[PDB]
Design a protein around this ligand. Structure first.
Ligand SMILES: [Mg+2]
Ligand SMILES: [Mg+2]
Ligand SMILES: [Mg+2]
Ligand SMILES: [Mg+2]
Ligand code: NA
Ligand code: NA
Ligand code: NA
Ligand code: NA
Ligand code: NA
Lengths: 1015, 210
């Protein structure tokens, strides 16, 4: 009847014989083990090697498989996604469903994973009590057999499915058979922007409970007005025979100290005309001066729930970590423990580049440490309930969590087609209700979300109200249908901009500042997604944070997103490389759109991460005279692990330094008086840099961790000294093809046909491989490209505007190339025009002044046609012959920075290996720029001025033409791009132009000057 | 010491080119030994009788942002009309120029002065590409005012009726001019984007006889 009923094509059937959802159980039989959270003998892991066979459809599965193992089957580690073992291909699609949209039907070609395990069950487990199997995650639907007999069925890939195996098991060897379907009616609610995989991808376990058992428990904490008193309220439910001798004790522990305890017989208070719950009890424990839980200080207690006899014989104990905190919205503010939160959040998918969607403790811990080290205090479970250990870790390390139901129907037309249909209400309700039932005791969870990108439908309103009814302790949010519907307590837009309105029909994305004050609007605003970190991105990040700090009701947001969803593939030589959409033969696909992370898939930081860390700092600084004002943005903690290091340097040369301990109350200020700084004799700009250092290691950081920094310009002494007059005079030599200039062992050649410096010699060794030429383009960033495709052009995208205007095709036409001998110099004057189909795009006018000292001063004046799309850059480029080990510069660094993403960068003297001057974005683009640079050193060369630059072994052309970083080849010599001006990178989103007006090169006329010499 | 600053010559050189004479100058404006501004200029006079002036200015980051970055001179000529291609016809400043239209404007000299009862900098026109006065034409991309009153006299005179026309005509040509503000008139009100804070500034002018 299994293949006959086709339950995987029925949204009315989401499970068969599945047990009720509940908070994490271990059925300890010793209270001390429960208290200490030590392993339980009643909870066994089936995370071992299983037998696995792949099939094209469920109809192709042989009957024998239920009884006997298949010889064709392989031995695979479980948990796993079977795509990660190569059994079929992972599919990366964003919005469009990976299957034909024909609800509730799925393709007849439905990849089917047949898992089986032969395992021992001890007789003790079967003599008494209840043995259940727990599948924490099966994607996307499954049938279960035990010793050849059908047990049941489950859907929803992201919550545990549990079955009673008591009547199916025998002493000794048993066999489980699990038939996992890739596609089901459940898939229509699982259209998240991520890799589409399948299998038993989370833990499998066996749990033994007594016949009379704790079946559910809820913990609540309520407070008086100043949080100096709390009542812990614990509702406990039992299953089994009701008896007068039964008791529940809830005891609360702080370390080895019991702080409160309550004992009661079963039998709740009367609730209606038919009485009360005889099988329930509510315990109420008083806690004086409770230690409060927050992301700042994750104070936890241990609650132990003992089911026992009046006489004190233990039946079983369950337990959980308890965080005393209150979450509420009052007067339009989200408050934690009475204080308004500022969410430094990030969206995080469950992704590993080797194991796919299987999560391990090591990776989770790595993520949490990196998050907190980079000033994040919050995470959104985008877009499904996570591995249960995640919440425990967030409880303990201290991160605010948005727990989000596994519901996304992005691909529907319109988006609410299913969520407004009462026939899909049952499937939806289960994804919401079973999440709440599982995770409601975790203090880290502060907000419930109804899912993602599923429009707004009546089913959302019903489930919003359900959650508010069952759990008034947490706000409910949901972004669908315009981010401010009746199904959300928080205005939670995705990619709403700071100042710019995007007035889309029906679902406008208002400026976040404007949104708050719309007539009648009073709710807090926290972006569920913002600052799309796709490739070279996070331009304008500082603008969000300025607004967040200025506006009380702008309470932050969650960056999209934490980690690149790249997957490891291997080339012919067995060398690993990062793959994205389409690289597995998957079609249709959405290519590199799966990589939007602040970190690479292996958790190496993108440069954007430092910009996030800096903008998310918890200490704010102001300078007035010799006084530094430090303001704390902590709501609860004092700065008891913080010292301020200050340093004053003249053009990167240290002059003075010192350290002052921080003693700042939460929300408080401290004044730090800098000592009198000695005047520098020499010219240059004095810079003050401050850093907040954590002297002591924490659970999340090492000793000496830097949590915050800031810089100011102090006194500047402009150089008024005349350079010592030169003895020699450069000699100009002329032919029809060249102007040549000689001075000692130095020669410059200007080609008279092209009008560019074509060559430069030191001694007699050539310095250039390609001439020094103007450049007005960049290898397009993901933000420049957007959603444009070779087949379907998006004419609005920056890359398409530049292409249509002929920016990449434009050839330099020489207008003027003259040479003049001066008293102590040779002067070369050039003029060029870049034209496309009779339209002049740019005019570049230059002077090159080569004096007796050997220095070449280059003056560049560029005109940009007002009606051409604003160019990506205004600069020069050349391929240098030299490949040197180090790059040394006085400017912003040490990391990659761009005009709209440079606040985190510091002005100083930086020295890095050449490789560090290249950012290995998986999709190659313009990268490695450093801005605000006054001096650049490379081999024998020095450039001085006020410029942006990048330097690498890859030309803009190669970066432009190559789709994957692993296919890039180091070119001969070094490509240098020196820009007077560079366009913003944007990133508010990555599917429409997002570079703010102030970062577009729209001035029409541009001027810059460089000095090139040998040191 | 902005009002008191004296120019100190750092460099003044002259060069002959194939078809032009090139004059290069550098000045430091200082007060009590502190350098406030450095101005580096080239003047290029060619066979057409056009003088191309390039001006590159450094402003010390720790000096208050200056009110303007420009040139001035008292012209000998007093002419009746002022003709310009730029924003007008009325007085306009960088933070008050939205009402002004780009066109060819022609006004009597008196209209180029705004008779504020308390005298101050006045009559600026922004976004000007060409200016004509008597025998002179200036081209570039500049802001200008032109009147019979020096900045010194306007600064020293509390009432408009006490102003006297000076000999010739005072010309101020600015590459850059600070906002005028006005959110209120008792605290600084010039918005950051209209303060001359960039540190380094470039403009260029062509002066010829037309
Ligand atoms: Mg079904
Ligand atoms: Mg989506
Ligand atoms: Mg800063
Ligand atoms: Mg206008
Ligand atoms: Na705020
Ligand atoms: Na994406
Ligand atoms: Na401290
Ligand atoms: Na590329
Ligand atoms: Na006055």
């Amino acid at each position: 009847v299994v293949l006959q009923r086709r339950d995987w094509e029925n949204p009315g059937v989401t499970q068969l014989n599945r047990l009720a959802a509940h908070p994490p159980f271990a059925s300890w039989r010793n209270s001390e083990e429960a208290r200490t959270d030590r392993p339980s003998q009643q909870l066994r892991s089936l995370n071992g090697e299983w037998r696995f066979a792949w099939f094209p459809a469920p109809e192709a599965v042989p009957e024998s498989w239920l009884e006997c193992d298949l010889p064709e089957a392989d031995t695979v580690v479980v948990p796993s996604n079977w795509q990660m073992h190569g059994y079929d291909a992972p599919i990366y699609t964003n919005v469009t469903y990976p299957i034909t949209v024909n609800p509730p039907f799925v393709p007849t070609e439905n990849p089917t994973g047949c898992y089986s395990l032969t395992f021992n069950v001890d007789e003790s487990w079967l003599q008494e009590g209840q043995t259940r199997i727990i599948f924490d995650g099966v994607n996307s639907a499954f049938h279960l057999w035990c010793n050849g007999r059908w047990v049941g069925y489950g859907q929803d890939s992201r919550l545990p499915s549990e079955f009673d195996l008591s009547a199916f098991l025998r002493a000794g060897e048993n066999r489980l058979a699990v038939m996992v379907l890739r596609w089901s009616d459940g898939s229509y609610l699982e259209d998240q922007d991520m890799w589409r995989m399948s299998g038993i991808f989370r833990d499998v376990s066996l749990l033994h409970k007594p016949t009379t058992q704790i079946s559910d428990f809820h913990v609540a904490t309520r407070f008086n007005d100043d949080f100096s008193r709390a009542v812990l309220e614990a509702e406990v439910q039992m299953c089994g025979e009701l008896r007068d001798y039964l008791r529940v004790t809830v005891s609360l522990w702080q370390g080895e100290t019991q702080v409160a305890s309550g004992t009661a017989p079963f039998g709740g208070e009367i609730i209606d005309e038919r009485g009360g719950y005889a099988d329930r009890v509510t315990l109420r424990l008083n806690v004086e001066n409770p230690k409060l839980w927050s992301a700042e200080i994750p104070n936890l207690y241990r609650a132990v729930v003992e089911l026992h006899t009046a006489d004190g014989t233990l039946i079983e104990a369950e337990a959980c970590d308890v965080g005393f905190r209150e979450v509420r919205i009052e007067n339009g503010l989200l408050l934690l423990n009475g204080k308004p939160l500022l969410i430094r959040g990030v969206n995080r998918h469950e992704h590993h580049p080797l194991h796919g969607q299987v999560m391990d403790e090591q990776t989770m811990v790595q993520d949490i440490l990196l998050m907190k080290q980079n000033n994040f205090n919050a995470v959104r479970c985008s877009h499904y309930p996570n591995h249960p250990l995640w919440y425990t870790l967030c409880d303990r390390y201290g991160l605010y969590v948005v727990d989000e139901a596994n519901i996304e129907t992005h691909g529907m037309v319109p988006m609410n087609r299913l969520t407004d249909d009462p026939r899909w209400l049952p499937a939806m309700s289960e994804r919401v209700t079973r999440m709440v039932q599982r995770d409601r005791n975790h203090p880290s969870v502060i907000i419930w979300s109804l899912g993602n990108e599923s429009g707004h439908g009546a089913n959302h309103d019903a489930l919003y109200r359900w959650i508010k009814s069952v759990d008034p302790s947490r706000p409910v949010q949901y972004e669908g249908g315009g981010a401010d519907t009746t199904a959300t307590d928080i205005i939670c837009p995705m990619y709403a901009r700071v100042d710019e309105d995007q007035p889309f029909p029906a679902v406008p994305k208002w400026s976040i500042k404007k949104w708050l004050s719309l007539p009648g609007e009073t709710r807090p605003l926290i972006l569920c997604e913002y600052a799309h970190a796709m490739g070279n991105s996070l331009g304008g990040f500082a603008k969000y944070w300025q607004a967040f700090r200025q506006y009380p009701r702008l309470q932050g947001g969650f960056v999209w997103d934490w980690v690149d969803q790249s997957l490891i593939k291997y080339d012919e030589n067995g060398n690993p490389w990062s793959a994205y959409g389409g690289d597995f033969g998957d079609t249709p696909n959405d290519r590199q759109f799966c990589m939007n992370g602040l970190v690479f898939a292996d958790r190496t930081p993108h440069p954007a991460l430092t910009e996030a860390k800096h903008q998310q700092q918890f200490f704010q600084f102001r300078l007035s005279g010799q006084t530094i004002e430090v303001t704390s943005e902590y709501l609860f903690r004092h700065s008891d692990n913080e010292l301020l290091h200050w340093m004053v340097a003249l053009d990167g040369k240290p002059l003075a330094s010192g350290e002052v301990p921080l003693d700042v109350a939460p929300q408080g200020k401290q004044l730090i008086e800098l000592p009198e700084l000695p005047q520098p004799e020499s010219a240059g700009q004095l810079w003050l840099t401050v850093r907040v250092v954590q002297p002591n290691a924490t659970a999340w950081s090492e000793a000496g961790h830097i949590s915050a920094w800031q810089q100011w310009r102090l006194a500047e002494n402009l150089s008024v000294t005349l350079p010592a007059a030169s003895h020699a005079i450069p000699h100009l030599t002329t032919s029809e093809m060249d102007f040549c200039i000689e001075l000692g062992n130095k020669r410059w050649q200007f080609n008279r046909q092209s009008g560019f410096l074509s060559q430069m010699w030191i001694g007699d060794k050539k310095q250039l491989l390609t001439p020094l030429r103007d450049q007005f383009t960049r290898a397009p960033l993901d933000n420049d490209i957007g959603v444009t495709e070779a087949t379907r052009i998006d004419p609005n995208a920056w890359v398409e505007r530049w292409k249509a205007a002929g920016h990449y095709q434009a050839e330099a036409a020489l207008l003027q190339c003259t040479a003049d001998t001066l008293a102590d110099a040779v002067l070369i004057t050039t003029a060029h025009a870049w034209q496309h189909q009779g339209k002049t795009l740019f005019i570049s006018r230059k002077t090159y002044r080569i004096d007796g000292s050997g220095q070449m001063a280059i003056t560049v004046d560029v005109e940009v046609a007002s009606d051409t799309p604003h160019p990506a850059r205004i600069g020069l480029n050349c391929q240098l012959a030299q490949v040197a080990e180090r790059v040394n510069w006085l400017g912003l660094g040490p990391q990659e920075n761009y005009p709209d993403r440079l606040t985190a960068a510091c002005f100083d003297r930086w020295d890095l290996p050449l490789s560090d001057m290249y950012t290995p974005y998986v999709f190659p683009s313009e990268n490695g720029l450093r801005c605000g640079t006054r001096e650049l050193n490379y081999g024998p060369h020095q450039w001085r001025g006020d410029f942006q630059f990048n330097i690498s072994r890859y030309s803009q052309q190669q970066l432009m033409e190559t789709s994957h970083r692993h296919l890039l080849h180091a070119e001969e010599g070094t490509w240098l791009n020196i820009d007077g001006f560079h366009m913003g990178i944007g990133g508010d989103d990555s599917w429409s132009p997002s570079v703010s007006a102030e970062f577009q090169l729209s001035a029409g006329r541009y001027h810059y000057q460089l000095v090139w010499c040998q040191k």
